[PDB]
Amino acid sequence: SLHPRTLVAAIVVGLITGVLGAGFKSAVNNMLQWRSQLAQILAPIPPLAWLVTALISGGMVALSFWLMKRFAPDTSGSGIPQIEGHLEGKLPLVWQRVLPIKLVGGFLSLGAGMLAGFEGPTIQMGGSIGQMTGGWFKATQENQRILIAVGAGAGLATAFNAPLAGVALIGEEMHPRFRSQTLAYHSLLFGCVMATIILRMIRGQSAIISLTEFKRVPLDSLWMFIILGILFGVMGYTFNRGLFKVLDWFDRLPPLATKWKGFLLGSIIGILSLFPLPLTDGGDNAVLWAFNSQSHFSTLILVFCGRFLLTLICYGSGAIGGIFAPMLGIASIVSVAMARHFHLLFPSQIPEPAVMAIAGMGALVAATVRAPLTAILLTIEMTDNYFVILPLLVTCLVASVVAEALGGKPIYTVLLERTLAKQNR
């Protein structure tokens, strides 16, 4: 029941966000390693670098907070809420403000080593482009919502080289109307495909962490992932609660504290960037650290607590963030620790314990977001592994059920109610 003019528009949307998302990630990574190489040049003598890396990080983050307001406080935090809202009625979206501020601002935040969060910027920048090209194409009212949704989806696909995930995002979480043109699915797929094709031409083509050869997953091992789900259930519950309490604390000023909040917060992160441990940055490193670098079980617990708190502090401060990746890093660290433990206890049912690490990789996301279907897809797409689906399905949706059984609520719908409460920012 689809319509051409809108499909070609999607081709354009996904194409643009693809180029941007890819270049954005590349840009952020360049800045990340540049600050890492600067710390080593000065490393020899002595903690001089301690001061230098502290300034650069603190300065960037502060400069980022400034570029936020005044200019577009709308770009604060994730991006799912702002687009989920606009797409629904409440809250506006103006690309001329979001696009440049989210980009330049997001670059400063992430590049400084903040605990975010590529999908943050790339998802809002996606929606912006979707809208910006919606006008260029003189799209109808409904069609423009679609184009914005496509951008949002393409945004996620670009951050993780995960087409299906981006598509599922709009579908499950952020369920929009589309009336009656529900065949915005085509627009989505189109937008996502292009985005990743460009994403792969620029930095592709491989996945984030391909673990394709772990395929032995016995059926009488499933009971385990129920427990693993129960675990990520309460974990997601406290993560949400904690986030909100840290969100309040940061809302409570004082006017002076806020002025320094930008610099102080960014300078500590800069210090923690130096230690040889993945307790900063987006979370990709954290995942690429759980697997594969074998490290002391204690160090796992150590880095888990560090990141779990630090992400709360980082996102809680309201910096240009993005919470997806950080929860992937936290989960993958926990799932590895749990993988080891269960292999310890029932090796005959967990021959390859990597299976479990993979299963719980998207479990935290499913619990905190109420979006198991997308969390499942996400991990599949970023491990090229479908063999782990049964454990995946069980752990992810049991984590989701247990979370909203303790009454946790979708982190994004709450994050929206709050950003709405700022109808006087």
| Count, residues near a second copy per rule CB under 8 A | 49
Query: Which one of 322, 326, 372, 410 is in contact with Cl ion (CB under 5 A)?
Result: 322
**How many whole angstroms separate alpha carbon 230 and alpha carbon 16?**
41
User: Does the footprint of a second copy cover residue 175 (CB under 8 A)?
Assistant: yes
Task: Work out how close the CB of 421 gets to Cl ion at its nearest, in angstroms, rounded to a whole number.
Answer: 19
Stretch that binds Cl ion, among 115-123, 248-256, 336-344, 368-376 (CB under 5 A): 115-123
User: Does the footprint of a second copy cover residue 400 (CB under 8 A)?
Assistant: yes
Stretch that binds a second copy, among 99-107, 113-121, 293-301, 369-377 (CB under 8 A): 369-377
User: Does the footprint of a second copy cover residue 164 (CB under 8 A)?
Assistant: yes
Task: Work out how close the CB of 325 gets to Cl ion at its nearest, in angstroms, rounded to a whole number.
Answer: 8
Stretch that binds a second copy, among 26-34, 132-140, 188-196, 289-297 (CB under 8 A): 188-196
Closest to 391 in 3D by CA, of 420, 344, 419, 350: 350
Q: What is the CA radius of gyration of the chain?
A: 21
Query: Which one of 36, 42, 52, 172 is in contact with a second copy (CB under 8 A)?
Result: 172
Contacted entry of a second copy, Cl ion, none for residue 183, CB cut-off 5 to 8 Å set by kind = a second copy
* ∠ Cα 291 294 297 (to 5°): 100
Residue with tokens 């752990």: 395
Contacted entry of a second copy, Cl ion, none for residue 360, CB cut-off 5 to 8 Å set by kind = none
Contacted entry of Cl ion, a second copy, none for residue 201, CB cut-off 5 to 8 Å set by kind = a second copy
Contacted entry of Cl ion, a second copy, none for residue 182, CB cut-off 5 to 8 Å set by kind = a second copy
Task: Work out how close the CB of 309 gets to a second copy at its nearest, in angstroms, rounded to a whole number.
Answer: 29
Q: Kindly list the distances between the CA atom of residue 376 and the CA atoms of 192, 258, 261, 299, 364, in Å, as whole numbers in the listed order.
A: 17, 38, 36, 27, 11
**How many whole angstroms separate alpha carbon 132 and alpha carbon 102?**
15
Task: Work out how close the CB of 350 gets to a second copy at its nearest, in angstroms, rounded to a whole number.
Answer: 16
Closest to 77 in 3D by CA, of 317, 252, 398: 317
Half-sphere exposure of 221 (CA within 13 A, CB side): 24
122, 158 Cβ separation under 8 angstroms: yes
CA 135 to chain CA mean position, Å: 28
Give phi and psi for 320, each to the nearest 5.
-65, 95
User: Does the footprint of Cl ion cover residue 81 (CB under 5 A)?
Assistant: no
Task: Work out how close the CB of 221 gets to Cl ion at its nearest, in angstroms, rounded to a whole number.
Answer: 31
**Per-residue DSSP letters for 339-369?**
HHHHHHH-TTT-SSTHHHHHHTTTHHHHHHH
**How many whole angstroms separate alpha carbon 291 and alpha carbon 152?**
29
147, 131 Cβ separation under 8 angstroms: yes
Contacted entry of Cl ion, a second copy, none for residue 380, CB cut-off 5 to 8 Å set by kind = a second copy
42, 49 Cβ separation under 8 angstroms: yes
User: Does the footprint of Cl ion cover residue 119 (CB under 5 A)?
Assistant: yes
Residues lying near Cl ion in the complex (CB under 5 A) are found at 78, 119-120, 322-324
Residues lying near a second copy in the complex (CB under 8 A) are found at 1-2, 4, 7, 163-164, 167, 171-172, 175, 182-183, 185-186, 189-190, 192-193, 196-197, 200-201, 204-205, 212, 215, 219, 222, 370, 372-373, 376-377, 380-381, 384-387, 389-390, 393-394, 397, 400-401, 404-405, 410
